[model samples]
Target: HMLKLIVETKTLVQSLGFARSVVIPEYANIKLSAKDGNLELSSTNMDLYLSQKIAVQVLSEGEITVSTQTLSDIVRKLPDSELTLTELDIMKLEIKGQNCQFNLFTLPVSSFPAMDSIKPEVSFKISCADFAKIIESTKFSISLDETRYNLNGIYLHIKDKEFFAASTDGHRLSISWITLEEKIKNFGVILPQKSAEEILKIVKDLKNIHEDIEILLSSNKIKFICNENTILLSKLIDGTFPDYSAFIPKSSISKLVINRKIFADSIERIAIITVEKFRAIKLSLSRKTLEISAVGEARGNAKEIITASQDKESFYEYNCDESLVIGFNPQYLEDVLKAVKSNLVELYFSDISASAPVLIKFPQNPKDIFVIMPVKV
Candidate 1:
């Protein structure tokens, strides 16, 4: 049967955006099929699968596997007009638009791998805005070390009617949670960092639509459906994620209430003097002020002070005259501050120990939490 169709150039390019990251020379081939009045474009990198569908005027129904980059390159440069695609035979495709024409080679559609039948075990719906916010708050903490495979992804779970997303390197941890529309049984999975980033981008692109993105999860795979047009699927990480609950402090003996911008600004300035390897900065706290300082061997040191605020109920938890000191990688502190949405932040410490995990939380939002492990000053 002959395969011919007419589709809008912008529609094709926008649909192909979902699979753009998966197209490389080694894995650049994508299957394009027109059947049942819809044109489907699909691609995969073995671990990730993306598919997009758009309506088209089909002259005849058939399928072809073609180079995604080649198609995208040609279609993107075409003038704003309708594009006509015709499959001359099983091996050739002719594309014409805007008084230009090009012939491209096609491979047999049978060469494309079959996508898994996604049997959704559990599914949930969330707005694109909420989904994007959850991803942005924790993605920065994902571990880049491939050797620790489990740490290279974000941990997602449902507990106590709330959905949670968390990520951590050995040095810093970030956790964010939101209440779900419907109560769900507790389940957890680790999503690869790259996959999380791609999902975030898709959700961000659709944020203005005000539609809910449905998430489908199985034991081994996860899928996202957005606006009935774009779909993304990925295999879950195989190893067990760390038990992150142990890292959050049950209660803090000392807490510092400080302006978010002031603390972040002070850390940014002092971090300049520190060595590139450690980037350690000391936090010296007293009753009247908070001091941020960094010492660089033979490079000099920097010290800055910002006004401090405290909770009166727990004001005596640590002595004001003792000048409690703790050391941290300034970059870690800066990342958490940037992610937080509140004007004021609460930093909690169990004691003055240099190795204790310092808990950071927004004064207005209890669902978001951050923990940074201290380094020796």
Candidate 2:
């Protein structure tokens, strides 16, 4: 059967931000091909990898490798109109648009990074939803310390009928739980930091409820089947993640449950003018109203305040979920707050003086939670 003519754009540019340090010649290689009815684009940095494919009516079946930057530019600029792509011999790509066309140079398909081949000694899998939740819960804690290789990625562990994940930046930890559908004696994988984040981004907007996301793990490579629309191949981190179970206390004596939205909004509104470097927000808890305030604790310190709705400002709707003296970097708080999929939430803290880990969740179905460590106010 003759392969059909497909895409007709020469340039598509989308900022990939910064490339990873280890991305060398092989990893920089991109694979572009049109088969059946899909246009597949794949690239990898070895550690952080992306393989995105779009549904296109294929007039021809073909495969080729080219500079990702070159092709990305072509596809991105393609108008909200149709484009067709054809493959030339020697691994080159020819793209055409409604009013323009170009022949893009090619890289040898042989230079493309090969998936690391290693037989799986231990294997287990989880749903994309559960996997995403694990990444999110623990990702906040994964240490950004380049010196600590093991703590750079989310740590996943499976035993019997449960799954556990924990990430920390050395100061605080975020732990998430999921009950496995079946018992697995023992299995674990330390997913590369960038890979886990990319997987989260890809699935965050998915609407299909019945899609099956499969995880295939070998000694060196991990693959995700994200609904046939996307497949991510990543290099597994080599180091063993540190055991984080030791970080959680068995019992919390100073637990405070506060309204999540009230606290988050108060943190956001007050921390805006807090300070340049110290995004710290000071929180004061009392009998009725909780005074949430931020002060410029540094040179020429400035101050902002959100008086509890109970104070003379009784008209202000504080709607606090709980009470505690907790301070946090506004930037970090915002990151945690944006992921909230609910209007009202719960805030939990263990103590005041320590780096309190604040958990945010919807009151009723507390399936998702966000944890932030308090910074000195």
> Which numbered prediction scores highest in TM-score against the true structure?
1
lDDT of each: 0.82, 0.61
Per-residue lDDT over 68-157 for candidate 1, one digit per residue giving the tens place of the 0 to 100 score: 888888888999569999999649999988688989899877778767767877789887877777788899999998899989999988
Which residue segments of model 2 deviate by more than 4 Å? 1-4, 7-23, 35-38, 48-57, 89-92, 121-126, 205-210, 273-279, 297-332, 349-362, 368-377
- In model 1, which range of ten residues has the least summed lDDT? 311-320
Prediction 1 TM-score vs. true = 0.87
TM-score of every candidate: 0.87, 0.78
Q: Which run of 10 residues does model 2 get worst, by summed lDDT?
A: 11-20
Q: What lDDT is obtained when candidate 2 is compared to the true structure?
A: 0.61
With candidate 2 superimposed using the best TM-score fit, by how many Å does residue 287's alpha carbon deviate from the native? 2.5
In model 1, how large is the Cα lDDT of residue 364? 73
Question: Per model, how many backbone clashes are there?
Answer: 0, 35
- Deviation from native of the Cα of residue 41 in model 1, angstroms: 1.7
